[PDB]
Amino acid sequence: AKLHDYYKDEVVKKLMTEFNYNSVMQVPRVEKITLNMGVGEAIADKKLLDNAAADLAAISGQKPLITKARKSVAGFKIRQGYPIGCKVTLRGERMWEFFERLITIAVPRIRDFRGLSAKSFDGRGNYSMGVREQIIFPEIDYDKVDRVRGLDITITTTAKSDEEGRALLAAFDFPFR
Amino acid sequence: RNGRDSEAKRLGVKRFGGESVLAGSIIVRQRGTKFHAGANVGCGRDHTLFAKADGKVKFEVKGPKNRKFISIEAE
Amino acid sequence: DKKSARIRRATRARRKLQELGATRLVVHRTPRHIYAQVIAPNGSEVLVAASTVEKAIAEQLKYTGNKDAAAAVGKAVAERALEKGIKDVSFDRSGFQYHGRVQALADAAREAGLQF
Amino acid sequence: GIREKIKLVSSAGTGHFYTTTKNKRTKPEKLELKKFDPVVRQHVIYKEAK
Amino acid sequence: MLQPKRTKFRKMHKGRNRGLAQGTDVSFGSFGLKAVGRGRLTARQIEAARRAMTRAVKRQGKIWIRVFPDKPITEKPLAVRMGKGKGNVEYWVALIQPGKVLYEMDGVPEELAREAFKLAAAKLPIKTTFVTKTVM
RNA sequence: ACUUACCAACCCGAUGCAAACUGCGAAUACCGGAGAAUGUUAUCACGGGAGACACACGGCGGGUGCUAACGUCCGUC
RNA sequence: CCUCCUAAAGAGUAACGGAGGAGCACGAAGGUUGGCUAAUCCUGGUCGGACAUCAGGAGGUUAGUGCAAUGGCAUAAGCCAGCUUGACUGCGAGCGUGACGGCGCGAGCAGGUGCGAAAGCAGGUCAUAGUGAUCCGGUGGUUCUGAAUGGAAGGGCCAUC
RNA sequence: GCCUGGCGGCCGUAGCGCGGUGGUCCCACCUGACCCCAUGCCGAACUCAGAAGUGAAACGCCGUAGCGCCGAUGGUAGUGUGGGGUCUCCCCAUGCGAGAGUAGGGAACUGCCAGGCA
């Protein structure tokens, strides 16, 4: 909520100035934020994926969608249709609320925080970063965990290149190494 | 090991371009829709094309994919 | 592909109307307007038309592009259809869902007296 | 092979039955369908039998 | 002895060897051996001719083989009757039509090329001729 | 992780091959309509009576055989 | 019995010729309404490895089809969901393919029904294998017959084993 | 006359890429989401109430032979009929005559209706 109109006020102006765009809508906009776990070992037991879904519900307000294995691979013992992960898509007001809850609260709580990567931009202006411990999030209580599992957060954008994607993310005070 | 075959199915175009047809006459028997159906031509469950009206058979090529269509022109 | 999806979604109904040889009342919709045409079986001549972008029905609307506008356009197209002598037609939603403004136009035409 | 023949008998008392097949091993619940009964000329529930 | 590494099928029909050769020009090297006649060229024959010409040019220049035997030829054993299924594959041949450039050669003088190709053609079952690269 | 006299998929250029390959594609044959001329109706149907169902070689297109056989098995004359 | 090739560009065409399958499956894997679009690879990303899920990009069917092969399929015939039983009953112009026994396709009419606002679609499934004449007999229905008469036995007709 | 939208004809000489260009109307994105309606999560899409902004992306138009596409003439292969040979394959007379390739073309053409601006 706050970061929405902060973007509209400050970030639009600054990006306009420092990339000489011609029209306002040329400025990049944060499209969506996708949180995901690949549950992995839960082919044997379904309960792990249910716990992961509960973790997603705790982190992001909306409930998660269970993803299927999409094919059969004999190496990892999977087949088409077996649940192998869980995902949440965040857009709009809830996207900005989660972006606050990440950037302000979860960012200062990485073990031996050596900054953060910057090459990870997909070459087209979309960011992705993995956290190694779901307990990093505040609502996940330290006592209500049966197994430790990290997750991946992918922040997409309407940017055309990694350079302006980096510019937009830096405008929100995102950490970098 | 190789002394086997199936009875031939007598598939093919049973009624050629321009010939007069009564309603219900099979035009072409086909595996798959090699000829599609156009005006006054019905497609059967095994993809047979038959005349839904008395007329004359006409072959054409239509559409982006250059597919062959069977139509019956009322004489 | 928000456009191409709509055309490939409407294509089956378009074609089926072509084999059936029906005079089709095609509806087009857009965030600001709604258009209606009645098109003969050959698919290349419009017998009657209607739209919110006119002046016969544009000043009697708070905002072109609402359910009231769709109802007005339906009534207008049905009235001119009956004036030109076309009664039995087939609705062609043109890939829009038969839910909102589209059905508003459709039921307006039905009430005005188009059989479909 | 495994799939065994059954008859679906009318619930209108006419003695009419359709005949079909069923895999007894999977889905053992009795089959029940609205079918046309020509003796009474109505659609009626037909129940698995035999 | 050349042979396909694998094939869709194991036994081909006899067919016919009619028509004129495609690939009738010296494309890679400077000199070539061209087929004036018509017939089969077996993998054994191809190996024999290749060995003869490679010995004629004592590890020098470069040699291309344009024909590859990809047709299985079956033969029934002795003391066996007709029918009882098609025979078993025994060797592979390349069908040669007139004009087919069989071998190609570069990096050698023309005299040595001619000598090597005479020694090679002494091993093949079809009449051949010497050809040289041409422009257009 | 250096590297490599062995090997090296992809892709790019050139080069061929295929009955069970085809982004092409004939000549013929076949189906249908119209028009003369010509032909002892030579076409169709129905009824009385059969015989015959070991074929042979030649030409062309092929399978098989060794593009072996006065070989064998098909198509067509 | 089904697919391809031999098979000579309509059909058809043989050999102890070359290659593969079938003797099922599914009350949903059928019907209808609405919606959707694959394989592969590239890049970035927690456990992650060449290959698990996510994000975007190139690509455009190199996927999928219940089971062989061929031919088809984007209006999709491929995938998903809601309601359903047309896997209906009597017929059927007219065709195709068989020496025949038969096999197959079929608009349309009557009855009643499902889905869809409606136009309409539906007489099983992308199509082509999944099969066995006749006789004898068993079961349900049907007062058709019923050997002096009334029944009944037995027989016929319809459905079915 | 110019521009846009809807529906057709034809189905790459019509496409894909590269460069430029347009917001009066139209179209596009766009603003919000109690309700109509919907997400196997998400107002992303479907859908509803609107019109602050921009033509950024999409879309239309214009230019460009980068790729696709089209493509002669002549020759060649093949082949019906008749004849011949050195008869596993060819040749002669006559009729039909490819495919590939070369030269070259190519930045589609057109019908009904509606709106804006002349």
mmCIF file of N, CA, C and O (backbone and C1' of nucleotides) in Angstrom, chain G residues 84-121:
data_model
loop_
_atom_site.group_PDB
_atom_site.id
_atom_site.type_symbol
_atom_site.label_atom_id
_atom_site.label_comp_id
_atom_site.label_asym_id
_atom_site.label_seq_id
_atom_site.Cartn_x
_atom_site.Cartn_y
_atom_site.Cartn_z
ATOM 1 P P U G 84 -27.500 -33.045 -12.892
ATOM 2 O "O5'" U G 84 -27.949 -33.315 -14.396
ATOM 3 C "C5'" U G 84 -28.285 -34.620 -14.843
ATOM 4 C "C4'" U G 84 -27.834 -34.843 -16.264
ATOM 5 C "C3'" U G 84 -27.861 -36.280 -16.754
ATOM 6 O "O3'" U G 84 -29.139 -36.630 -17.255
ATOM 7 C "C1'" U G 84 -25.822 -35.203 -17.387
ATOM 8 P P U G 85 -29.885 -37.964 -16.771
ATOM 9 O "O5'" U G 85 -29.657 -38.978 -17.972
ATOM 10 C "C5'" U G 85 -29.757 -38.536 -19.320
ATOM 11 C "C4'" U G 85 -29.084 -39.493 -20.264
ATOM 12 C "C3'" U G 85 -29.543 -40.940 -20.145
ATOM 13 O "O3'" U G 85 -29.477 -41.560 -21.427
ATOM 14 C "C1'" U G 85 -27.237 -40.804 -19.655
ATOM 15 P P G G 86 -30.551 -41.201 -22.565
ATOM 16 O "O5'" G G 86 -29.674 -41.043 -23.880
ATOM 17 C "C5'" G G 86 -28.825 -42.096 -24.315
ATOM 18 C "C4'" G G 86 -27.979 -41.682 -25.493
ATOM 19 C "C3'" G G 86 -27.051 -40.494 -25.256
ATOM 20 O "O3'" G G 86 -25.856 -40.676 -26.016
ATOM 21 C "C1'" G G 86 -28.510 -40.005 -27.037
ATOM 22 P P A G 87 -24.552 -41.321 -25.342
ATOM 23 O "O5'" A G 87 -24.402 -42.732 -26.056
ATOM 24 C "C5'" A G 87 -25.515 -43.608 -26.138
ATOM 25 C "C4'" A G 87 -25.115 -45.051 -26.270
ATOM 26 C "C3'" A G 87 -26.021 -46.028 -25.526
ATOM 27 O "O3'" A G 87 -26.154 -47.225 -26.290
ATOM 28 C "C1'" A G 87 -23.801 -46.283 -24.780
ATOM 29 P P C G 88 -27.134 -47.269 -27.561
ATOM 30 O "O5'" C G 88 -28.567 -46.939 -26.959
ATOM 31 C "C5'" C G 88 -29.023 -45.599 -26.848
ATOM 32 C "C4'" C G 88 -30.379 -45.539 -26.196
ATOM 33 C "C3'" C G 88 -31.518 -46.179 -26.970
ATOM 34 O "O3'" C G 88 -31.568 -47.583 -26.811
ATOM 35 C "C1'" C G 88 -32.192 -44.064 -26.174
ATOM 36 P P U G 89 -31.901 -48.513 -28.072
ATOM 37 O "O5'" U G 89 -33.459 -48.315 -28.301
ATOM 38 C "C5'" U G 89 -34.404 -49.120 -27.624
ATOM 39 C "C4'" U G 89 -35.806 -48.843 -28.098
ATOM 40 C "C3'" U G 89 -36.063 -48.962 -29.588
ATOM 41 O "O3'" U G 89 -36.139 -50.290 -30.072
ATOM 42 C "C1'" U G 89 -37.063 -47.000 -28.808
ATOM 43 P P G G 90 -35.670 -50.610 -31.575
ATOM 44 O "O5'" G G 90 -36.894 -50.124 -32.470
ATOM 45 C "C5'" G G 90 -38.209 -50.597 -32.227
ATOM 46 C "C4'" G G 90 -39.235 -49.813 -33.005
ATOM 47 C "C3'" G G 90 -39.101 -49.855 -34.516
ATOM 48 O "O3'" G G 90 -39.686 -51.017 -35.072
ATOM 49 C "C1'" G G 90 -39.487 -47.625 -33.790
ATOM 50 P P C G 91 -38.994 -51.769 -36.306
ATOM 51 O "O5'" C G 91 -39.201 -50.773 -37.526
ATOM 52 C "C5'" C G 91 -38.114 -50.039 -38.066
ATOM 53 C "C4'" C G 91 -38.594 -48.804 -38.780
ATOM 54 C "C3'" C G 91 -37.873 -48.450 -40.067
ATOM 55 O "O3'" C G 91 -38.314 -49.210 -41.173
ATOM 56 C "C1'" C G 91 -38.136 -46.512 -38.747
ATOM 57 P P G G 92 -37.274 -49.653 -42.309
ATOM 58 O "O5'" G G 92 -36.723 -48.280 -42.887
ATOM 59 C "C5'" G G 92 -37.596 -47.323 -43.465
ATOM 60 C "C4'" G G 92 -36.878 -46.025 -43.731
ATOM 61 C "C3'" G G 92 -35.608 -46.139 -44.560
ATOM 62 O "O3'" G G 92 -35.883 -46.112 -45.947
ATOM 63 C "C1'" G G 92 -35.173 -44.862 -42.618
ATOM 64 P P A G 93 -34.788 -46.570 -47.023
ATOM 65 O "O5'" A G 93 -34.928 -45.471 -48.163
ATOM 66 C "C5'" A G 93 -36.164 -44.807 -48.388
ATOM 67 C "C4'" A G 93 -35.969 -43.461 -49.045
ATOM 68 C "C3'" A G 93 -34.910 -43.404 -50.130
ATOM 69 O "O3'" A G 93 -35.390 -43.850 -51.381
ATOM 70 C "C1'" A G 93 -34.586 -41.613 -48.637
ATOM 71 P P G G 94 -34.709 -45.111 -52.097
ATOM 72 O "O5'" G G 94 -33.242 -44.600 -52.420
ATOM 73 C "C5'" G G 94 -33.021 -43.244 -52.767
ATOM 74 C "C4'" G G 94 -31.639 -42.787 -52.386
ATOM 75 C "C3'" G G 94 -30.507 -43.712 -52.766
ATOM 76 O "O3'" G G 94 -30.197 -43.647 -54.144
ATOM 77 C "C1'" G G 94 -30.167 -42.903 -50.573
ATOM 78 P P C G 95 -29.289 -44.781 -54.814
ATOM 79 O "O5'" C G 95 -27.814 -44.268 -54.546
ATOM 80 C "C5'" C G 95 -26.768 -45.193 -54.351
ATOM 81 C "C4'" C G 95 -25.795 -44.721 -53.310
ATOM 82 C "C3'" C G 95 -24.658 -45.679 -53.046
ATOM 83 O "O3'" C G 95 -23.648 -45.592 -54.023
ATOM 84 C "C1'" C G 95 -25.565 -44.986 -50.995
ATOM 85 P P G G 96 -23.283 -46.889 -54.884
ATOM 86 O "O5'" G G 96 -21.925 -47.375 -54.227
ATOM 87 C "C5'" G G 96 -21.007 -46.426 -53.715
ATOM 88 C "C4'" G G 96 -20.275 -46.964 -52.518
ATOM 89 C "C3'" G G 96 -19.737 -48.373 -52.657
ATOM 90 O "O3'" G G 96 -18.517 -48.416 -53.369
ATOM 91 C "C1'" G G 96 -20.790 -48.112 -50.554
ATOM 92 P P U G 97 -18.195 -49.653 -54.330
ATOM 93 O "O5'" U G 97 -17.968 -50.857 -53.324
ATOM 94 C "C5'" U G 97 -16.954 -50.796 -52.340
ATOM 95 C "C4'" U G 97 -17.002 -51.996 -51.438
ATOM 96 C "C3'" U G 97 -17.212 -53.331 -52.124
ATOM 97 O "O3'" U G 97 -16.034 -53.842 -52.715
ATOM 98 C "C1'" U G 97 -18.627 -53.182 -50.244
ATOM 99 P P G G 98 -16.129 -55.021 -53.795
ATOM 100 O "O5'" G G 98 -16.363 -56.320 -52.908
ATOM 101 C "C5'" G G 98 -17.233 -57.356 -53.332
ATOM 102 C "C4'" G G 98 -17.657 -58.217 -52.170
ATOM 103 C "C3'" G G 98 -18.420 -59.484 -52.513
ATOM 104 O "O3'" G G 98 -17.574 -60.542 -52.924
ATOM 105 C "C1'" G G 98 -19.521 -58.362 -50.760
ATOM 106 P P A G 99 -17.335 -60.837 -54.483
ATOM 107 O "O5'" A G 99 -18.478 -61.872 -54.868
ATOM 108 C "C5'" A G 99 -19.526 -61.508 -55.753
ATOM 109 C "C4'" A G 99 -20.514 -62.632 -55.928
ATOM 110 C "C3'" A G 99 -21.586 -62.742 -54.853
ATOM 111 O "O3'" A G 99 -22.707 -61.925 -55.125
ATOM 112 C "C1'" A G 99 -20.592 -64.859 -55.205
ATOM 113 P P C G 100 -23.376 -61.055 -53.959
ATOM 114 O "O5'" C G 100 -23.942 -62.130 -52.934
ATOM 115 C "C5'" C G 100 -24.977 -63.029 -53.298
ATOM 116 C "C4'" C G 100 -25.077 -64.170 -52.319
ATOM 117 C "C3'" C G 100 -25.338 -63.779 -50.875
ATOM 118 O "O3'" C G 100 -26.714 -63.579 -50.623
ATOM 119 C "C1'" C G 100 -23.608 -65.400 -50.983
ATOM 120 P P G G 101 -27.193 -62.723 -49.357
ATOM 121 O "O5'" G G 101 -26.682 -63.557 -48.101
ATOM 122 C "C5'" G G 101 -27.337 -64.742 -47.674
ATOM 123 C "C4'" G G 101 -26.620 -65.361 -46.498
ATOM 124 C "C3'" G G 101 -26.413 -64.450 -45.302
ATOM 125 O "O3'" G G 101 -27.547 -64.376 -44.461
ATOM 126 C "C1'" G G 101 -24.390 -65.559 -45.805
ATOM 127 P P G G 102 -28.186 -62.953 -44.109
ATOM 128 O "O5'" G G 102 -26.935 -61.976 -44.065
ATOM 129 C "C5'" G G 102 -26.384 -61.533 -42.834
ATOM 130 C "C4'" G G 102 -24.905 -61.265 -42.963
ATOM 131 C "C3'" G G 102 -24.432 -59.878 -42.562
ATOM 132 O "O3'" G G 102 -24.317 -59.694 -41.164
ATOM 133 C "C1'" G G 102 -23.455 -60.462 -44.617
ATOM 134 P P C G 103 -24.613 -58.254 -40.525
ATOM 135 O "O5'" C G 103 -23.348 -57.378 -40.928
ATOM 136 C "C5'" C G 103 -22.030 -57.813 -40.638
ATOM 137 C "C4'" C G 103 -21.010 -56.931 -41.308
ATOM 138 C "C3'" C G 103 -21.211 -55.435 -41.143
ATOM 139 O "O3'" C G 103 -20.781 -54.936 -39.890
ATOM 140 C "C1'" C G 103 -20.791 -55.901 -43.403
ATOM 141 P P G G 104 -21.633 -53.798 -39.137
ATOM 142 O "O5'" G G 104 -21.320 -52.470 -39.959
ATOM 143 C "C5'" G G 104 -19.981 -52.045 -40.155
ATOM 144 C "C4'" G G 104 -19.845 -51.075 -41.303
ATOM 145 C "C3'" G G 104 -20.598 -49.766 -41.189
ATOM 146 O "O3'" G G 104 -19.976 -48.844 -40.319
ATOM 147 C "C1'" G G 104 -20.792 -50.620 -43.384
ATOM 148 P P C G 105 -20.864 -47.855 -39.429
ATOM 149 O "O5'" C G 105 -21.244 -46.676 -40.422
ATOM 150 C "C5'" C G 105 -20.237 -45.847 -40.972
ATOM 151 C "C4'" C G 105 -20.792 -44.920 -42.018
ATOM 152 C "C3'" C G 105 -22.021 -44.120 -41.633
ATOM 153 O "O3'" C G 105 -21.739 -43.020 -40.791
ATOM 154 C "C1'" C G 105 -22.299 -44.989 -43.799
ATOM 155 P P G G 106 -22.875 -42.449 -39.818
ATOM 156 O "O5'" G G 106 -24.021 -41.970 -40.811
ATOM 157 C "C5'" G G 106 -23.782 -40.941 -41.756
ATOM 158 C "C4'" G G 106 -24.935 -40.790 -42.714
ATOM 159 C "C3'" G G 106 -26.289 -40.518 -42.087
ATOM 160 O "O3'" G G 106 -26.472 -39.149 -41.785
ATOM 161 C "C1'" G G 106 -26.500 -42.231 -43.695
ATOM 162 P P A G 107 -26.863 -38.672 -40.304
ATOM 163 O "O5'" A G 107 -27.863 -37.460 -40.561
ATOM 164 C "C5'" A G 107 -27.441 -36.310 -41.276
ATOM 165 C "C4'" A G 107 -28.324 -36.023 -42.465
ATOM 166 C "C3'" A G 107 -29.759 -35.628 -42.169
ATOM 167 O "O3'" A G 107 -29.887 -34.272 -41.778
ATOM 168 C "C1'" A G 107 -29.714 -37.201 -43.932
ATOM 169 P P G G 108 -30.976 -33.841 -40.679
ATOM 170 O "O5'" G G 108 -32.306 -34.582 -41.135
ATOM 171 C "C5'" G G 108 -33.145 -34.028 -42.136
ATOM 172 C "C4'" G G 108 -34.256 -34.976 -42.503
ATOM 173 C "C3'" G G 108 -35.241 -35.312 -41.398
ATOM 174 O "O3'" G G 108 -36.222 -34.309 -41.210
ATOM 175 C "C1'" G G 108 -34.575 -37.295 -42.475
ATOM 176 P P C G 109 -36.948 -34.154 -39.788
ATOM 177 O "O5'" C G 109 -37.986 -35.358 -39.753
ATOM 178 C "C5'" C G 109 -39.129 -35.357 -40.592
ATOM 179 C "C4'" C G 109 -40.015 -36.543 -40.318
ATOM 180 C "C3'" C G 109 -40.463 -36.721 -38.880
ATOM 181 O "O3'" C G 109 -41.542 -35.881 -38.524
ATOM 182 C "C1'" C G 109 -39.704 -38.782 -39.715
ATOM 183 P P A G 110 -41.716 -35.412 -37.002
ATOM 184 O "O5'" A G 110 -42.133 -36.740 -36.235
ATOM 185 C "C5'" A G 110 -43.376 -37.369 -36.502
ATOM 186 C "C4'" A G 110 -43.626 -38.529 -35.574
ATOM 187 C "C3'" A G 110 -43.325 -38.291 -34.107
ATOM 188 O "O3'" A G 110 -44.336 -37.564 -33.435
ATOM 189 C "C1'" A G 110 -42.415 -40.357 -34.762
ATOM 190 P P G G 111 -43.971 -36.726 -32.120
ATOM 191 O "O5'" G G 111 -43.558 -37.832 -31.054
ATOM 192 C "C5'" G G 111 -44.511 -38.749 -30.545
ATOM 193 C "C4'" G G 111 -43.871 -39.744 -29.615
ATOM 194 C "C3'" G G 111 -43.154 -39.164 -28.409
ATOM 195 O "O3'" G G 111 -44.039 -38.826 -27.357
ATOM 196 C "C1'" G G 111 -41.803 -40.817 -29.420
ATOM 197 P P G G 112 -43.902 -37.418 -26.604
ATOM 198 O "O5'" G G 112 -42.652 -37.621 -25.638
ATOM 199 C "C5'" G G 112 -42.746 -38.463 -24.500
ATOM 200 C "C4'" G G 112 -41.399 -38.989 -24.073
ATOM 201 C "C3'" G G 112 -40.380 -37.961 -23.620
ATOM 202 O "O3'" G G 112 -40.579 -37.478 -22.308
ATOM 203 C "C1'" G G 112 -39.351 -39.415 -25.124
ATOM 204 P P U G 113 -40.035 -36.020 -21.925
ATOM 205 O "O5'" U G 113 -38.453 -36.183 -21.958
ATOM 206 C "C5'" U G 113 -37.797 -36.952 -20.966
ATOM 207 C "C4'" U G 113 -36.345 -37.199 -21.287
ATOM 208 C "C3'" U G 113 -35.391 -36.038 -21.105
ATOM 209 O "O3'" U G 113 -35.086 -35.769 -19.750
ATOM 210 C "C1'" U G 113 -34.861 -37.208 -23.088
ATOM 211 P P G G 114 -34.538 -34.321 -19.330
ATOM 212 O "O5'" G G 114 -33.014 -34.341 -19.775
ATOM 213 C "C5'" G G 114 -32.054 -35.095 -19.057
ATOM 214 C "C4'" G G 114 -30.668 -34.873 -19.601
ATOM 215 C "C3'" G G 114 -30.215 -33.428 -19.689
ATOM 216 O "O3'" G G 114 -29.741 -32.931 -18.449
ATOM 217 C "C1'" G G 114 -29.711 -34.546 -21.713
ATOM 218 P P C G 115 -29.893 -31.376 -18.080
ATOM 219 O "O5'" C G 115 -28.809 -30.656 -18.990
ATOM 220 C "C5'" C G 115 -27.442 -31.014 -18.917
ATOM 221 C "C4'" C G 115 -26.633 -30.334 -19.989
ATOM 222 C "C3'" C G 115 -26.949 -28.877 -20.261
ATOM 223 O "O3'" C G 115 -26.424 -27.988 -19.294
ATOM 224 C "C1'" C G 115 -26.744 -30.010 -22.304
ATOM 225 P P G G 116 -27.179 -26.607 -18.992
ATOM 226 O "O5'" G G 116 -27.023 -25.776 -20.338
ATOM 227 C "C5'" G G 116 -25.764 -25.254 -20.723
ATOM 228 C "C4'" G G 116 -25.810 -24.655 -22.102
ATOM 229 C "C3'" G G 116 -26.833 -23.563 -22.335
ATOM 230 O "O3'" G G 116 -26.472 -22.314 -21.771
ATOM 231 C "C1'" G G 116 -26.896 -25.060 -24.134
ATOM 232 P P A G 117 -27.423 -21.635 -20.668
ATOM 233 O "O5'" A G 117 -28.467 -20.793 -21.526
ATOM 234 C "C5'" A G 117 -29.764 -20.498 -21.027
ATOM 235 C "C4'" A G 117 -30.545 -19.634 -21.987
ATOM 236 C "C3'" A G 117 -30.810 -20.238 -23.358
ATOM 237 O "O3'" A G 117 -31.970 -21.048 -23.378
ATOM 238 C "C1'" A G 117 -29.921 -18.073 -23.619
ATOM 239 P P A G 118 -32.111 -22.233 -24.449
ATOM 240 O "O5'" A G 118 -31.761 -21.553 -25.844
ATOM 241 C "C5'" A G 118 -32.704 -20.731 -26.511
ATOM 242 C "C4'" A G 118 -32.138 -20.186 -27.796
ATOM 243 C "C3'" A G 118 -31.749 -21.223 -28.838
ATOM 244 O "O3'" A G 118 -32.855 -21.625 -29.630
ATOM 245 C "C1'" A G 118 -29.970 -19.696 -28.539
ATOM 246 P P A G 119 -32.810 -22.983 -30.486
ATOM 247 O "O5'" A G 119 -31.803 -22.655 -31.672
ATOM 248 C "C5'" A G 119 -32.068 -21.596 -32.577
ATOM 249 C "C4'" A G 119 -30.880 -21.313 -33.458
ATOM 250 C "C3'" A G 119 -30.301 -22.511 -34.187
ATOM 251 O "O3'" A G 119 -31.020 -22.831 -35.365
ATOM 252 C "C1'" A G 119 -28.553 -21.287 -33.176
ATOM 253 P P G G 120 -31.335 -24.363 -35.722
ATOM 254 O "O5'" G G 120 -29.893 -25.002 -35.901
ATOM 255 C "C5'" G G 120 -29.610 -26.316 -35.453
ATOM 256 C "C4'" G G 120 -28.378 -26.347 -34.588
ATOM 257 C "C3'" G G 120 -27.910 -27.727 -34.164
ATOM 258 O "O3'" G G 120 -27.097 -28.343 -35.149
ATOM 259 C "C1'" G G 120 -28.002 -26.308 -32.274
ATOM 260 P P C G 121 -27.288 -29.893 -35.511
ATOM 261 O "O5'" C G 121 -26.395 -30.646 -34.432
ATOM 262 C "C5'" C G 121 -25.043 -30.280 -34.216
ATOM 263 C "C4'" C G 121 -24.532 -30.802 -32.897
ATOM 264 C "C3'" C G 121 -24.857 -32.251 -32.582
ATOM 265 O "O3'" C G 121 -23.979 -33.165 -33.211
ATOM 266 C "C1'" C G 121 -25.361 -30.918 -30.709
#
